């Protein structure tokens, strides 16, 4: 089940999730969705039945509305008048029975309840014997996530990517960081591969001592 | 609505030995038609989707070891996990699917537990263009320690800092089990360069004396 729709929204706006089921049938399954706030714990959402009919947690009845119709293999959350508590990763939650609610998963699709416009991160430098440091400071981005990869997904050993601090601005901020031997500097190059899809930047950094 | 309460909620025991995590339905979910309990357990890594474990209250489901098992029936369960492996570091959590809505247990975060280990210590002054967009942030790294617990003070011309700093620490590494921490000290440029020393100081169960690393503006 791969989870899409999921993106930046204002207030009151609204939002369509899709589901691919590409493994097994959406017919012949029952199919729900569960979130999860971040940081937090699971919430149940919606289910609509092999069968057809509908039911709906208290905090979503009216506002969502669950939709099925066996296209390309496809499930669907129709969300309408959106809070700010609505703000979550949504999950497709594939049953294995009728009254048989053993959850399975895909990957999740991140809602952000936001009036904010999409703002792309800058990237500085974090400049480096036995064991140097050094990293990338990935600054004021709004929203999440960003992902870092260091010499294209090529160097892992080391790499500390933290996670990102909310900071008094409202933007966000992370660090990635890796450990390296220091005769090793001014030979092999080190650089960070950015990537903040929301607001589809990509920015590729050297990390010079 | 099933109320599902999990205790404990937080959780850290050492390789090889036993964790175990217990669970409370306000209601019996034991259906007296196959008399099979309608309790699961999950396990959710991070940034991973909660993955089944046991399903019927103490039923596996394939492709789950052996070591861990669920038991309990009706209000009460229980899931235990013998010999906690590296790859068992997660969140876990109970839910219910006797009666819609399906409800879940707020979950319990179930570390691994070693030996103290001493954090390495980096200091980073603010790179050259961010000085060009008017501000510095000076960054300080503690690498790879145990346990969690770690006190960074900034000191700036050995005057302390209070409120202009945040942090992050980084999910327990599943490979060695040590954690690691960011510090970023964010001023204006107007504000850094004002003063001439800035120290980063780290305060760990490690340390056998606190460990500064400092830096004067410019060098």
């Known amino acids: 089940l791969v989870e899409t729709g999921g993106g930046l929204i204002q207030p009151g706006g609204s939002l369509r999730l899709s589901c691919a089921a590409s493994?097994?049938?959406?017919?012949?399954?029952?199919m729900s969705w569960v979130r999860q706030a971040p940081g937090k714990g699971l919430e149940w959402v919606s289910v609509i039945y092999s069968g057809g009919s509908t039911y709906y947690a208290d905090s979503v009845k009216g506002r969502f509305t669950i939709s099925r119709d066996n296209s390309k293999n496809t499930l669907y959350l129709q969300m309408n008048s959106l809070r700010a508590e609505d703000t979550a990763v949504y999950y497709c939650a594939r049953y294995d029975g009728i009254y048989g609610e053993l959850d399975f998963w895909g990957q999740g699709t991140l809602v952000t309840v936001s009036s904010a416009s999409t703002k792309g991160p800058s990237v500085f430098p974090l400049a480096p014997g036995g064991t140097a440091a050094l990293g990338c400071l990935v600054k004021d981005y709004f929203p999440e996530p960003v992902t870092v990869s260091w010499n294209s997904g090529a160097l892992t050993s080391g790499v500390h990517t933290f996670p990102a601090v909310l900071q008094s601005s409202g933007l966000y901020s992370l660090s990635s960081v890796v450990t390296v031997p220091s005769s090793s500097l001014g030979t092999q190059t080190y650089i960070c591969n950015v990537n903040h899809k929301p607001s589809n930047t990509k920015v590729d950094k050297k990390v010079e001592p | 609505d099933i109320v599902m309460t999990q205790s404990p909620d937080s959780l850290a025991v050492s390789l090889g030995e036993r964790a175990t995590i217990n669970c409370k339905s306000s209601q019996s979910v034991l259906y007296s038609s196959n008399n099979k309990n309608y309790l699961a357990w999950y396990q959710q890594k991070p940034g991973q989707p909660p993955k089944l474990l046991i399903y019927?209250?103490?039923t596996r489901e394939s492709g789950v070891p052996d070591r861990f098992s669920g038991s309990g029936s009706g209000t009460d369960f229980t899931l235990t996990i013998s010999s906690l492996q590296a790859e068992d570091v997660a969140v876990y959590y109970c839910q219910q699917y006797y009666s819609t809505p399906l409800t879940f247990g707020q979950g319990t975060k179930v570390e691994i537990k070693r030996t103290v280990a001493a954090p390495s210590v980096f200091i980073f002054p603010p790179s050259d263009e961010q000085l060009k967009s008017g501000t510095a942030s000076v960054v300080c790294l503690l690498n790879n320690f145990y346990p969690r617990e770690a006190k960074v003070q900034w000191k700036v011309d050995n005057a302390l800092q209070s409120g202009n700093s945040q942090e992050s620490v980084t999910e327990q590494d599943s490979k060695d089990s040590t954690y690691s921490l960011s510090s970023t000290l964010t001023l204006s440029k107007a504000d850094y360069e004002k003063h001439k020393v800035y120290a980063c100081e780290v305060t760990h169960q490690g340390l056998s004396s606190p460990v500064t690393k400092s830096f004067n503006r410019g060098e």
């Open positions: 493994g097994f049938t959406v017919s012949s399954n029952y």
């Open positions: 019927w209250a103490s």
